[PDB]
């Protein structure tokens, strides 16, 4: 909104209170919006044994449809925005302005693929708190959207040509970060909770678990027109808000359809001690702060 002439501001997207704030806001939204029929949460320490907190309540079938959220300055603070079209989120920003509010952010909860978000204005961008650390998530921001169309009938469709173009662009960016003589390999999730091993999201109020192996099974710098991912709608889920399990009622609609735009990805690199000149990347995610981080990386709040 108002450009700060000749001002240089340090940004750190990995330590940003706006992310924590949004996270608590979305947790509240979901707790008041999507009520489980049964909720089971652990409770330990004291005497020795563990306990389980159980809540049972009416669980109305509702159609969840994210509305954009705008974050404006909290009392006593100002929001600064980095204007650099290609900014990695961590370091000095030479083109910074003050804004009244963030742009409208749809609080989409998902793993692996980031949906309905903002595209990079220039080239594909990759971001990590530490690329050398294989345990740290890589946030990818695409410059071109890829449609993913899903049905409660048990699958999602993605255009193979579009996805392949996308992969080439990501791989090029990854070898630009890890080495130009590196072969870039994409592989399926190596394991963990279902919400993390599959592309997991909510559509029409139902929780989808889509097998993403076909999206992450290629080698770069070493088919059919449509990629069809098999999916499963589940009633018993691991909650993202905290370490709990929830049960929901089965679906009541026979026509569940969602079409989203893939605008980013959450990846991790295998790494490990290897003299081999290749790098393996797998879909990741699970910590929804990374989802919020993918949108808030260019903002920070400062004391006035």
């Amino acid at each position, epitope marked *: 909104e108002v450009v700060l002439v000749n001002v240089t501001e340090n940004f750190n997207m990995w330590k940003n209170d706006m992310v924590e704030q949004m996270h608590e806001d979305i947790i509240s939204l979901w707790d008041q919006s999507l009520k489980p029929c*049964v909720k089971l949460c652990p409770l330990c320490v004291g005497a020795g044994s563990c306990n389980t907190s159980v809540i049972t309540q*009416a669980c109305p079938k509702v159609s969840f449809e994210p509305i954009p959220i705008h974050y404006c300055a909290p009392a006593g603070f100002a929001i600064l925005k980095c204007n650099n079209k290609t900014f990695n989120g961590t370091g000095p920003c030479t083109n910074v302005s003050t804004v009244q509010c963030t742009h409208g952010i749809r609080p989409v909860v998902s793993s692996q693929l980031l949906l309905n978000g903002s595209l990079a204005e220039e080239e594909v961008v990759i971001r990590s708190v530490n690329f050398t650390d294989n345990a740290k998530t890589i946030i990818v921001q695409l410059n071109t959207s890829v449609e993913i169309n899903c049905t409660g009938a048990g699958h999602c469709n993605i255009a193979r040509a579009k996805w392949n173009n996308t992969l080439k662009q990501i791989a090029s960016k990854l070898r630009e970060q890890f080495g130009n003589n590196k072969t870039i390999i994409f592989k399926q999730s190596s394991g963990g909770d*279902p919400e993390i091993v599959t592309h997991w999201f909510n559509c029409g109020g139902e929780f989808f678990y889509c097998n993403s192996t076909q999206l992450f099974n290629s080698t770069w710098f070493n088919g059919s027109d449509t990629i069809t991912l098999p999916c499963r709608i*589940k*009633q*018993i889920i691991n909650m993202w808000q905290k370490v709990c399990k929830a049960m929901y*009622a089965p679906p009541i609609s026979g026509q569940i359809r969602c079409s989203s735009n893939i605008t980013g990805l959450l990846l991790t690199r295998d790494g490990g001690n290897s003299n081999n000149e290749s790098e393996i990347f797998r879909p990741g995610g699970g910590d929804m702060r990374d989802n919020w981080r993918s949108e808030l990386y260019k903002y920070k709040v400062v004391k006035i």
Partner: antibody
Amino acid sequence: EVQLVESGAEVKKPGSSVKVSCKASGDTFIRYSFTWVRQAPGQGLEWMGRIITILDVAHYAPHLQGRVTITADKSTSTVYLELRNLRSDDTAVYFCAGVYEGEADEGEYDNNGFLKHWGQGTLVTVSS
Amino acid sequence: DIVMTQSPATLSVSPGERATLSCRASESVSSDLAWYQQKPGQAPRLLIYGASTRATGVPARFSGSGSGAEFTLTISSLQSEDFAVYYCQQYNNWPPRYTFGQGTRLEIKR
């Protein structure tokens, strides 16, 4: 399909507690929910409660809430009903029953409230 | 609680003829309604669930219909093994507080 075999008849004085069991054989235990239903002599069926076996969570009829506990031992595929502070009017045949809920181990759960499989019943007589 | 009422209390039907049994709920239970058959000294047997779906092993002559608060079980031609007591059960509520009707006794009219 599961086969349900219940423990033998019980005789109790009023004020006692009783614990009846039901062994489920023949299918995968955690894909079933189990329900206890009782029937006093000459009377109808009364729903007592139901356990969501995979979650180890049970829900009970309001008139019994407080003195009934339903549990399940996954290791022995056995379901238990405990009824406390017994009254003479708790005299009944107690049935274990169950229904398949879907691929529960993969997160599919129909939460079926009807009852396909039934045990042979256990007579519990409560009297002075 | 949801009260289930069956009528009549006793139904007398000549062998080979049709029987119609009624179940009423004190409020809507949608289609979450099951029918059971019980013979003396035996456990109940599931006949119908979801108001109209026959359970496995149930002959076609058994038919369930209705929705909301009014349901019917029809037996098109009574065989000797069909004479028994029949119960309806609602399982619509959550938290679960499922209830049974008080039964209709179907006996042989001679």
